[PDB]
CSV table of C-alpha atoms (C1' of nucleotides) in Angstrom, one decimal:
chain,number,residue,atom,x,y,z
A,1,UNK,CA,8.2,-5.1,19.7
A,2,UNK,CA,11.2,-7.6,19.0
A,3,UNK,CA,9.5,-11.0,19.3
A,4,UNK,CA,8.8,-13.5,16.4
A,5,UNK,CA,6.8,-17.2,16.2
A,6,UNK,CA,7.0,-20.0,14.0
A,7,UNK,CA,4.2,-21.2,11.6
A,8,UNK,CA,5.3,-18.9,8.9
A,9,UNK,CA,5.1,-15.3,9.4
A,10,UNK,CA,2.0,-14.3,11.0
A,11,UNK,CA,1.1,-13.9,14.4
A,12,UNK,CA,-2.5,-15.8,14.4
A,13,UNK,CA,-4.0,-17.9,11.9
A,14,UNK,CA,-6.6,-15.4,11.2
A,15,UNK,CA,-5.3,-12.1,9.5
A,16,UNK,CA,-6.8,-9.8,7.1
A,17,UNK,CA,-5.4,-6.3,4.7
A,18,UNK,CA,-7.4,-3.4,5.3
A,19,UNK,CA,-7.4,0.1,3.7
A,20,UNK,CA,-7.9,4.2,4.5
A,21,UNK,CA,-6.5,4.3,7.6
A,22,UNK,CA,-5.6,7.9,8.8
A,23,UNK,CA,-2.3,10.1,7.2
A,24,UNK,CA,-3.1,12.8,9.7
A,25,UNK,CA,-3.4,10.2,13.2
A,26,UNK,CA,-1.1,7.7,15.0
A,27,UNK,CA,-1.0,4.1,13.9
A,28,UNK,CA,-1.3,2.7,16.9
A,29,UNK,CA,-4.2,5.2,16.7
A,30,UNK,CA,-5.4,3.4,13.8
A,31,UNK,CA,-4.8,0.0,15.5
A,32,UNK,CA,-6.6,1.3,18.9
A,33,UNK,CA,-9.9,2.4,16.9
A,34,UNK,CA,-10.2,-1.2,15.2
A,35,UNK,CA,-9.4,-2.9,18.6
A,36,UNK,CA,-11.9,-0.9,20.4
A,37,UNK,CA,-14.7,-1.5,17.8
A,38,UNK,CA,-13.9,-4.7,17.9
A,39,UNK,CA,-14.0,-4.5,21.3
A,40,UNK,CA,-17.6,-3.6,21.4
A,41,UNK,CA,-18.1,-5.7,18.2
A,42,UNK,CA,-17.1,-9.0,20.5
A,43,UNK,CA,-14.0,-9.8,18.7
A,44,UNK,CA,-11.0,-10.8,19.7
A,45,UNK,CA,-8.3,-8.7,17.8
A,46,UNK,CA,-4.9,-10.7,18.3
A,47,UNK,CA,-3.1,-8.1,16.3
A,48,UNK,CA,-3.0,-4.8,13.8
A,49,UNK,CA,-0.7,-3.3,11.4
A,50,UNK,CA,-0.4,0.2,9.0
A,51,UNK,CA,-0.5,0.4,5.5
A,52,UNK,CA,2.1,2.6,5.8
A,53,UNK,CA,1.9,6.4,6.2
A,54,UNK,CA,-1.8,5.3,7.7
A,55,UNK,CA,-3.3,4.9,4.2
A,56,UNK,CA,-3.8,1.6,4.5
A,57,UNK,CA,-3.4,-1.6,7.2
A,58,UNK,CA,-3.3,-4.8,8.3
A,59,UNK,CA,-5.3,-6.7,11.1
A,60,UNK,CA,-5.1,-10.5,13.0
A,61,UNK,CA,-7.8,-11.8,14.8
A,62,UNK,CA,-8.1,-15.5,16.7
A,63,UNK,CA,-11.0,-17.7,14.9
A,64,UNK,CA,-13.1,-18.1,12.0
A,65,UNK,CA,-15.2,-16.6,13.9
A,66,UNK,CA,-13.4,-13.4,14.5
A,67,UNK,CA,-12.5,-13.5,10.7
A,68,UNK,CA,-15.8,-13.7,9.8
A,69,UNK,CA,-16.9,-10.9,11.8
A,70,UNK,CA,-13.7,-9.3,10.8
A,71,UNK,CA,-15.1,-9.0,7.2
A,72,UNK,CA,-18.7,-7.4,8.5
A,73,UNK,CA,-16.4,-5.5,10.3
A,74,UNK,CA,-15.4,-3.3,7.0
A,75,UNK,CA,-17.6,-0.4,8.3
A,76,UNK,CA,-14.7,0.6,10.9
A,77,UNK,CA,-14.1,4.2,10.6
A,78,UNK,CA,-10.9,5.1,11.9
A,79,UNK,CA,-10.5,7.8,13.6
A,80,UNK,CA,-12.8,8.8,11.2
A,81,UNK,CA,-11.4,6.6,8.2
A,82,UNK,CA,-14.1,4.0,7.5
A,83,UNK,CA,-11.5,1.9,6.7
A,84,UNK,CA,-11.7,-1.1,4.1
A,85,UNK,CA,-11.0,-4.6,4.3
A,86,UNK,CA,-10.3,-7.8,2.4
A,87,UNK,CA,-8.1,-10.9,2.2
A,88,UNK,CA,-4.5,-9.6,2.5
A,89,UNK,CA,-2.3,-9.3,-0.6
A,90,UNK,CA,1.3,-9.8,1.4
A,91,UNK,CA,3.6,-10.6,-1.8
A,92,UNK,CA,5.9,-8.3,-3.0
A,93,UNK,CA,7.3,-5.8,-0.5
A,94,UNK,CA,4.8,-2.6,-2.2
A,95,UNK,CA,7.5,-1.1,-4.2
A,96,UNK,CA,8.6,-4.9,-4.7
A,97,UNK,CA,6.0,-5.7,-7.6
A,98,UNK,CA,7.0,-2.3,-9.2
A,99,UNK,CA,9.7,-3.8,-10.6
A,100,UNK,CA,7.5,-6.6,-12.6
A,101,UNK,CA,4.9,-3.4,-13.2
A,102,UNK,CA,4.9,-0.7,-15.9
A,103,UNK,CA,2.3,2.1,-15.9
A,104,UNK,CA,0.6,4.0,-18.4
A,105,UNK,CA,0.9,7.8,-19.1
A,106,UNK,CA,-0.5,10.5,-21.5
A,107,UNK,CA,-4.2,8.6,-20.6
A,108,UNK,CA,-7.4,10.5,-21.0
A,109,UNK,CA,-10.6,10.6,-18.7
A,110,UNK,CA,-12.5,8.3,-20.7
A,111,UNK,CA,-9.9,5.2,-20.8
A,112,UNK,CA,-10.0,2.7,-17.8
A,113,UNK,CA,-8.2,-0.7,-16.5
A,114,UNK,CA,-11.0,-2.5,-19.0
A,115,UNK,CA,-9.5,-0.8,-21.9
A,116,UNK,CA,-6.1,-1.6,-20.5
A,117,UNK,CA,-7.0,-5.0,-19.9
A,118,UNK,CA,-7.8,-5.2,-23.7
A,119,UNK,CA,-4.5,-3.8,-24.7
A,120,UNK,CA,-2.6,-5.6,-21.6
A,121,UNK,CA,-4.0,-9.1,-22.3
A,122,UNK,CA,-0.4,-10.2,-20.7
A,123,UNK,CA,-0.6,-7.9,-17.7
A,124,UNK,CA,-2.2,-9.3,-14.9
A,125,UNK,CA,-2.9,-6.5,-12.8
A,126,UNK,CA,-3.6,-2.7,-13.2
A,127,UNK,CA,-4.1,0.3,-11.1
A,128,UNK,CA,-5.4,4.0,-13.0
A,129,UNK,CA,-3.3,6.7,-11.3
A,130,UNK,CA,-5.4,9.6,-10.7
A,131,UNK,CA,-5.0,12.5,-8.7
A,132,UNK,CA,-6.1,11.0,-5.4
A,133,UNK,CA,-10.0,11.9,-6.3
A,134,UNK,CA,-10.0,13.0,-10.1
A,135,UNK,CA,-8.6,11.1,-13.4
A,136,UNK,CA,-5.0,12.2,-14.1
A,137,UNK,CA,-4.2,9.7,-17.1
A,138,UNK,CA,-1.7,7.5,-16.0
A,139,UNK,CA,-2.6,3.4,-15.2
A,140,UNK,CA,-0.3,0.7,-13.7
A,141,UNK,CA,0.1,-2.2,-15.2
A,142,UNK,CA,2.3,-5.2,-13.8
A,143,UNK,CA,3.1,-7.7,-15.7
A,144,UNK,CA,4.0,-11.8,-15.0
A,145,UNK,CA,7.6,-10.6,-14.5
A,146,UNK,CA,10.5,-8.0,-15.8
A,147,UNK,CA,10.8,-8.9,-19.7
A,148,UNK,CA,6.6,-9.8,-19.4
A,149,UNK,CA,6.2,-6.2,-18.5
A,150,UNK,CA,8.7,-5.1,-20.8
A,151,UNK,CA,8.2,-7.0,-23.8
A,152,UNK,CA,4.4,-5.5,-23.6
A,153,UNK,CA,5.1,-2.1,-22.7
A,154,UNK,CA,7.5,-1.8,-25.8
A,155,UNK,CA,5.5,-3.6,-27.9
A,156,UNK,CA,2.3,-1.4,-27.3
A,157,UNK,CA,3.6,1.6,-26.3
A,158,UNK,CA,1.2,4.0,-27.8
A,159,UNK,CA,-2.1,2.3,-28.3
A,160,UNK,CA,-4.2,4.5,-30.6
A,161,UNK,CA,-7.3,4.8,-28.3
A,162,UNK,CA,-9.2,7.5,-27.0
A,163,UNK,CA,-8.0,10.0,-30.1
A,164,UNK,CA,-4.6,10.2,-28.2
A,165,UNK,CA,-1.6,7.7,-27.6
A,166,UNK,CA,-0.8,6.3,-24.3
A,167,UNK,CA,2.9,6.1,-22.8
A,168,UNK,CA,4.3,3.1,-20.5
A,169,UNK,CA,6.2,3.8,-17.6
A,170,UNK,CA,7.8,1.4,-16.0
A,171,UNK,CA,8.4,0.9,-12.4
A,172,UNK,CA,12.0,0.6,-11.1
A,173,UNK,CA,14.9,2.5,-9.9
A,174,UNK,CA,16.7,3.3,-13.1
A,175,UNK,CA,13.8,3.6,-15.3
B,1,G,C1',21.4,8.7,24.9
B,2,G,C1',16.4,10.0,23.4
B,3,C,C1',13.1,11.0,19.5
B,4,C,C1',10.7,11.8,14.8
B,5,G,C1',9.1,10.3,11.3
B,6,A,C1',8.5,11.2,5.4
B,7,A,C1',8.4,9.0,0.9
B,8,A,C1',8.1,5.4,-3.0
B,9,U,C1',2.1,8.4,-10.0
B,10,C,C1',-1.2,4.6,-9.2
B,11,C,C1',-1.2,0.5,-5.6
B,12,C,C1',-2.9,-2.5,0.0
B,13,G,C1',2.7,-4.7,5.4
B,14,A,C1',6.0,0.0,1.9
B,15,A,C1',7.1,0.9,7.6
B,16,G,C1',5.9,2.3,11.6
B,17,U,C1',11.0,1.4,7.2
B,18,A,C1',14.0,5.5,4.8
B,19,G,C1',16.1,9.9,6.5
B,20,G,C1',16.6,13.1,9.5
B,21,C,C1',15.9,15.8,14.2
B,22,C,C1',18.0,17.2,19.1
RNA sequence: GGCCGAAAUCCCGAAGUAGGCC
């Protein structure tokens, strides 16, 4: 579909983000499962997208009544994958935030975002990196900017905790 | 002239994008 509209960058006033789509299915299949469930729910999905690779995804409604039901619609099993839902975070092109972000490495099974939040008081967001279902030892951390994530990343780099030092791996192309 | 379709260590328009495949 090569059609665009005005207002800003959306097809409707009520939109939303979803997670857990289906990496073993199709994109239209993910949106159709949510479009069919809304047809039975009594909604009116105006549009739906995906979370690149069917990992997460998006949706769009035509009213505040579809957005409120769309909230309760977080119990959607996309082709057998209970998708998650919540306000959209459209800001950086997913791989764009990495520039102003840095992830910690060499962490442990006990450490956590809280501990990173205690060491990275300047970082605004953090994302623990495990093995898709099992603590791995890394933790992403985004700051107010590159110089911010860089000044803190270098300012700590190591943080003696859990009887172990946590390294910090930025997120760019040159690293 | 069709199609095919992965990644980006976590993470929520990456993308239905890149690269690739006939």
